[PDB]
Amino acid sequence: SLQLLNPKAESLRRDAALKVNVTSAEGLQSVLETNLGPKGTLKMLVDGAGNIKLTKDGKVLLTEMQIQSPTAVLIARAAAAQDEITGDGTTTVVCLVGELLRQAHRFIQEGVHPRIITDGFEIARKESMKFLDEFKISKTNLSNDREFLLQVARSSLLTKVDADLTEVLTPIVTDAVLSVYDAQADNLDLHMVEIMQMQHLSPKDTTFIKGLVLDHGGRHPDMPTRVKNAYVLILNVSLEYEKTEVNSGFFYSSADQRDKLAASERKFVDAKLKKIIDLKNEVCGMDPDKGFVIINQKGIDPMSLDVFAKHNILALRRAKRRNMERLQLVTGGEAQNSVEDLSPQILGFSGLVYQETIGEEKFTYVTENTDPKSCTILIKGSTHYALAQTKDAVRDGLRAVANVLKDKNIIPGAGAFYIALSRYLRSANMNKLGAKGKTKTGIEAFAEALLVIPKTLVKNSGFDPLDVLAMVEDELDDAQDSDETRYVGVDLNIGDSCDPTIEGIWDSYRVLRNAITGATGIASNLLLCDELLRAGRS
Amino acid sequence: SLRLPQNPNAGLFKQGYNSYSNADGQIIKSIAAIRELHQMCLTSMGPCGRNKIIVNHLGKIIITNDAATMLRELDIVHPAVKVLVMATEQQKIDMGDGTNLVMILAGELLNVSEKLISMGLSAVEIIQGYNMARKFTLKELDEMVVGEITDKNDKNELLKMIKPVISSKKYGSEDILSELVSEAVSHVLPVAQQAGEIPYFNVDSIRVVKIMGGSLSNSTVIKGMVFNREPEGHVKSLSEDKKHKVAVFTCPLDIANTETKGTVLLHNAQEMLDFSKGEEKQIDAMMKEIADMGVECIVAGAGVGELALHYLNRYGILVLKVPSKFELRRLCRVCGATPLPRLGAPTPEELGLVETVKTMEIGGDRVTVFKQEQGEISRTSTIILRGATQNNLDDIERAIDDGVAAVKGLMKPSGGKLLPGAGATEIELISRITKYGERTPGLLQLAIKQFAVAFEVVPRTLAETAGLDVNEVLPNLYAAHNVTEPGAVKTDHLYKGVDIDGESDEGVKDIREENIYDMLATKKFAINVATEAATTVLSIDQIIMAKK
Amino acid sequence: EKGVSDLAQHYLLKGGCSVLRRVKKSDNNRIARVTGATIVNRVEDLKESDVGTNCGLFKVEMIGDEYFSFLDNCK
């Protein structure tokens, strides 16, 4: 009846629309089916502009490649939002949404109404939350165990890269989150850790730095490159050509006044420079061994750079805005806007300050701080895409470790959470649940879809997913009557099971909680959509 | 039956997106795609290597055999080839040496991997085979090193470093090209022995000036920088000697103008009559303080007005224009001067020293001579390069930069660490890795033994480009390495290498007399980049492209 | 409501004032209702009667997408 409303329109409903959500989500899951797992495939994206994106993150695949199918657009926005808050779960939600649609599609063809199928999803999901309380293991942060943070950080590292880059980046991420934990317990992920792309040596040479690093360096040669003790002065005011306010200008009567009025431009510049000299007169003690540096947020007039060169003062201009907020955490001083009020208390402290000039760009390194409140991670790579591959590998590992210190609990990985829900939902009595009659079928479709992820991990290893899970179910049968509580994982190397607690495989708490809740709402809205049409004014 | 389903449910992505996976022989096509550009760089390897012509979209022609330079102008399509292209560019920037080795070695690792994949080796086991074999490779390079550079500068020792590097790039005459580069290196060295200071070197200090005409034998080394400039007021040979006092101003020479609404204000005719003579007294008062200090030359960084150039010709002061920045920055390093923006009298301690400034015709235009003399040594010397064709002038400029980059390798490490040349470095590693493959049980020995087979390309390339049969010459070279080591020490058989043309049959005795060696710091990063370049291609199971 | 200079934030920080990014006109009407404040354009006419009070809590929580500032009412 749509052809009468619009001259030209396209629409698909009932069995035509039922194949839209099931088939489109099947082709999207197949792309990320080989992605999941540490042995998963590696994909490279090359656009028409010549850029190269090489990563295993499923979020980059969705954002770079356009999707014509509207069904995957709902999944792409759900998978992208999962990586935003929790830093993980992009490929997990896609495997949950795509599979749950197919597991429930077999009963739709049998004549079961989609609503009573989606109603069983909420009943089965609420049981996963009640089971989540007994499934999680409490961890006390008062012990300050470093080995616990090492095994959790290696979960996301072994997935993105191999053991070569994992052993290098494991102590770097651990040392970065070590300074995040404080007596205040507040964890701020953005200001504590950054990603700075620089091409030097090899990617395996990436090292950790305990102090802020900047992309700028001294323009004048006489500026000291290495300063033992430097006092960092935070200046947010810029000395340079101003907007001048509509450019009114000067008018000179005689040629002697022409050069007399030209000296007024340096009057305002030298006015703020005398305050810095007066501040240097307090720290003048032990001047040869110590030093004084200036870090500006905005560009500095090259006319005034020769003033700092005679006093051996390092000047930094055009610094980032976020870097101004971290100068109090690194050095320990305070920020100063107006130069009228200056005190030695706001001056920072650094034990080592040096600059390494590579190519045309010059970088400034700061380290050896008394009580540094923040640190950095210097990313090194051989190629442009190598900088992005490490950027996506480290950043995804930040939210995984940061979420551990937020709560007191941690979730074991290696498919131990998905297998436990299969035996829980299938063996649970329906009288306790609010679902009865045909709604019992919707719960079974949700429990069977959770067993594909542990089977997806095996598909990348080459082993038969059906035979490797036969020994997993047989171990959990005798474990209940033996008075032994042990979680069974999946080891892809030997094709047998394992223990995630002994092997060190752990997953974040916020990732799986938001993934199941997010994937359920996506698949439910797709099963409840019986018609897909396109209309609009263009 | 008439038309295929044409891959149903393919509307998930745009029609321009294509999916290529290691299955269906596409990983073999990716390796076969390397061989298209691999054979291009094989004929360019060695002193007998052949240069290539590449015409860009703008019409500029760059004739060079360097793999890093050739891949810049070429438009690359296949994604995994860009991994090999960008791998050669990093080797040229970092060490400035061993660019053709990274291109050839990374290409041969994929060729031998075609047989490894056909036998069923997974991509994971192949990567572990190269990583374990590369760690053993880097450890054997430090054991086989012989000799050292010791002292920084020497007349003879600099012929064992820059000369073998520039022998592959525009071979031509040996001693002619080696003396020109080795002379400019000794000038930029601070020396100061026994002082314990940290040595320093700059790869951008030595500048190559391309001047058409003449011959290569007429080239020389100039301690000062050479530019094409025309003196404004007058030309002076400056035969009055007693050197000179020179000052450099990064700001132009002219009356200071207000940055906002510069305007002449005259209220009455009394101020108008003194306005013309007022500006003349301003430059006179400013230029008088400079002339009183004995400054015979002034370097300007921008356009200078005519009123300022008048009084400069009164005292006989030369005028120099230094546009942009980097051109003016290296001028002060020669004379040791510190620029200041003001037009007032410079500080006597900031004035430079240049004994003579000459203007003569070289390539048909007037050039200014900043050349220094024995005393009052200067830094950042330039090399005048004379040639008939401009195409040869471009690659020789990069050939000199390869010798300048080799000097940087004498600073950061503990020494030069010379390695046997003529391909003897990669051949000795074959017998060592072969013994290493047997010492490791398991299935990983397949990738380790084939990793040493990829090193056979160096002796085969030097033998093929020399017009010799690789089947006769190469097995005859293993006769020296098949006898292992005798019951007595002092074994010189490690100096055997591949010879070009001549009488063939190995030859040139031991390369110790030939003086051609290789750098250890170059071979360290050349193997690491080439291995990671081939590992990246083998670590990608599926390739996705857009628009094509 | 509009942008703020980096010079004005210093003298406000010395006295204890807090600076924020420019605010749309739609949000200015909702803030005045919660704290009972009155919008004051003229700085010279600012008085204690138009200052908002009875604010429960002011906190900022970290979320990867954007920052979030909370203003609680004393009810």
UniProtKB/Swiss-Prot annotation, chain A:
Q: Which residues carry this modification: Phosphoserine?
A: 248
Could you tell me which InterPro entries the record lists for this protein?
A: Chap_CCT_zeta, Chaperone_TCP-1, Chaperonin_TCP-1_CS, Cpn60/GroEL/TCP-1, GroEL-like_apical_dom_sf, GROEL-like_equatorial_sf, TCP-1-like_intermed_sf
Say which domain of life the source belongs to.
Eukaryota
Q: What does this protein do?
A: Molecular chaperone; assists the folding of proteins upon ATP hydrolysis. Known to play a role, in vitro, in the folding of actin and tubulin. In yeast may play a role in mitotic spindle formation.
According to the UniProt entry, its GO molecular function terms are: ATP binding; ATP hydrolysis activity; ATP-dependent protein folding chaperone; unfolded protein binding
What coarse category fits the chief subcellular location reported for this protein?
cytoplasm
Q: What is the lineage of its organism?
A: Eukaryota, Fungi, Dikarya, Ascomycota, Saccharomycotina
What processes in GO biological process is this protein linked to? chaperone mediated protein folding independent of cofactor; protein folding
Question: Is Phosphoprotein included in the keywords of this UniProt record?
Answer: yes
Q: Which keywords does UniProt give here?
A: Acetylation, ATP-binding, Chaperone, Cytoplasm, Nucleotide-binding, Phosphoprotein
**Mind telling me which SUPFAM superfamilies this protein's record contains?**
GroEL apical domain-like, GroEL equatorial domain-like, GroEL-intermediate domain like
NCBIfam families hit by this protein: chap_CCT_zeta
Annotated family: Belongs to the TCP-1 chaperonin family.
Q: Give all N-acetylserine modified positions.
A: 1
What is one GO cellular-component annotation here?
chaperonin-containing T-complex
As given in the record, the signal peptide range reads none
- Complex and partners: Heterooligomeric complex of about 850 to 900 kDa that forms two stacked rings, 12 to 16 nm in diameter.
| Species in which this protein is naturally found | Saccharomyces cerevisiae (strain ATCC 204508 / S288c)
The entry's protein name is T-complex protein 1 subunit zeta
Which locations, inside or outside the cell, does it occupy?
Answer: Cytoplasm
UniProtKB/Swiss-Prot annotation, chain B:
**InterPro entries linked to this entry:** Chap_CCT_theta, Chaperone_TCP-1, Chaperonin_TCP-1_CS, Cpn60/GroEL/TCP-1, GroEL-like_apical_dom_sf, GROEL-like_equatorial_sf, TCP-1-like_intermed_sf
Family note: Belongs to the TCP-1 chaperonin family.
Superkingdom classification of source: Eukaryota
Q: Name one GO cellular component term.
A: chaperonin-containing T-complex
Question: Which SUPFAM superfamilies does the record associate with it?
Answer: GroEL apical domain-like, GroEL equatorial domain-like, GroEL-intermediate domain like
Q: Report the protein's function.
A: Molecular chaperone; assists the folding of proteins upon ATP hydrolysis. Known to play a role, in vitro, in the folding of actin and tubulin. In yeast may play a role in mitotic spindle formation.
Q: Where is this cross-link: Glycyl lysine isopeptide (Lys-Gly) (interchain with G-Cter in ubiquitin)?
A: 14
Query: Which species is this UniProt entry from?
Result: Saccharomyces cerevisiae (strain ATCC 204508 / S288c)
Q: Which residues form a coiled coil?
A: none
List the molecular function annotations (GO) for this entry. ATP binding; ATP hydrolysis activity; ATP-dependent protein folding chaperone; unfolded protein binding
Tell me where it resides. Answer: Cytoplasm
Keyword terms of this UniProt record: ATP-binding, Chaperone, Cytoplasm, Isopeptide bond, Nucleotide-binding, Phosphoprotein, Ubl conjugation
Q: Which residues carry this modification: Phosphoserine?
A: 504
Give me any GO biological process, just one.
chaperone mediated protein folding independent of cofactor
Name of the protein this chain belongs to:
T-complex protein 1 subunit theta
Q: How does it assemble?
A: Heterooligomeric complex of about 850 to 900 kDa that forms two stacked rings, 12 to 16 nm in diameter.
Question: Pfam family example for this protein?
Answer: Cpn60_TCP1
From Swiss-Prot, chain C:
Give the source's domain of life in one word.
Answer: Eukaryota
Localization recorded for this chain is: Cytoplasm
Q: What function does this protein fulfil?
A: Molecular chaperone; assists the folding of proteins upon ATP hydrolysis. Known to play a role, in vitro, in the folding of actin and tubulin. In yeast may play a role in mitotic spindle formation.
Q: Family assignment?
A: Belongs to the TCP-1 chaperonin family.
Q: How does it assemble?
A: Heterooligomeric complex of about 850 to 900 kDa that forms two stacked rings, 12 to 16 nm in diameter.
- Quote the protein name from its UniProt record: T-complex protein 1 subunit gamma
Organism in which the protein naturally occurs: Saccharomyces cerevisiae (strain ATCC 204508 / S288c)
